[PDB]
Amino acid sequence: YLYAMVHDSTASTIVGDFNLGVTLTRIENFAGIGCNPGIQGARLLG
Amino acid sequence: TDLVMTMDFFVANVPCVPRIYNLGSPGQTLWLNRWMGKLSFGQGVSNDIKSMPL
Amino acid sequence: MDVDLFKLSLDDTSSVKGSLLDTRFAQVRVVIPKAMAGGNELLNSNLYDILVVDNNFRAAAALAHTHIIEGQIKCVCTINLPENTGCCLALCVNSSNRGQFSTDIYTIGSQDRMLWNPACSKNSTFTFNPNPCGTGWSLEFLRRTKFHISVVCVSGWSAQPQTDLVMTMDFFVANVPCVPRIYNLGSPGQTLWLNRWMGKLSFGQGVSNDIKSMPLAIGGGAGAKDSILMNMTNAYLSLWRYFHGDLVFEVNKMSSPYIKSTVTFFIGFGGVSFQPELEDFPNKLVQFSEVQEKIELKFTRAEFLTAWSTQVDPAAQLANDGCPYLYAMVHDSTASTIVGDFNLGVTLTRIENFAGIGCNPGIQGARLLG
User: Distance, in angstroms, between B13 CA and closest chain A CA?
Assistant: 25
List, as one string, the DSSP characters of C84-109: T---EEEEEEES---TT----HHHHS
Contact C313, C365 (CB under 8 A): yes
User: CA–CA separation, C201 vs C273, rounded Å?
Assistant: 17
* Residues of chain B neighbouring A17 (CB-CB closer than 8 A): 40-43
* C223 DSSP β-pair partners: C228
List, as one string, the DSSP characters of B16-54: -------SSS--SEEEEEEEEEEEEEPTT-SS-EEEE--
Contact state of C84 with A13 under an 8 Å Cβ cutoff: yes
Contact state of B26 with A32 under an 8 Å Cβ cutoff: yes
Query: Closest by alpha carbon to C111, among C226, C6, C232, C241?
Result: C232
Query: Closest by alpha carbon to C130, among C116, C144, C115, C151?
Result: C144
User: Distance, in angstroms, between A38 CA and closest chain C CA?
Assistant: 40
- Is B29 in CB contact (< 8 Å) with chain A? yes
Query: Closest by alpha carbon to C350, among C130, C183, C152?
Result: C183
Length of chain B: 54
> Strand (E) positions, chain C?
26-32, 41-46, 73-78, 88-94, 112-116, 123-128, 148-155, 165-173, 191-203, 211-215, 222-224, 227-229, 242-253, 262-269, 284-287, 294-299, 308-309, 324-330, 342-357
Contact C243, C237 (CB under 8 A): yes
Contact state of C162 with B44 under an 8 Å Cβ cutoff: yes
* Residues of chain C neighbouring A13 (CB-CB closer than 8 A): 82, 84-85, 159, 161-162
CA C78 to chain centre: 18
For chain A, helix, strand, coil in percent to 5 are 0, 35, 65
User: CA–CA separation, C325 vs C323, rounded Å?
Assistant: 7
Length of chain C: 370
Contact C228, C235 (CB under 8 A): no
Query: Could you give all domains of chain C from N- to C-terminal order, each with its CATH number?
Result: 1-370 (2.60.120.20)
- Is A14 in CB contact (< 8 Å) with chain B? no
Query: Closest by alpha carbon to C283, among C269, C304, C303?
Result: C303
* Residues of chain B neighbouring A18 (CB-CB closer than 8 A): 40-43
Q: What Cα–Cα distance (Å) separates residue C297 from each residue in C283, C304, C354, C355?
A: 11, 16, 17, 20
Cα end-to-end span (Å), chain B: 41
Q: Count Cβ atoms within 10 A of the Cβ of residue C88 and give its class: 0-12 exposed, 13-18 middle, 19 or more buried.
A: buried
Question: Residue C222 contacts by C-beta under 8 Å, 6 or more apart in sequence?
Answer: C104, C106, C197, C228, C229, C230, C366, C367, C368, C369
Strand order in the sheet with C41-46: C41-46, C148-155, C88-94, C112-116
Among C78, C85, C162, select the one facing A15 at the smallest CB separation.
C162
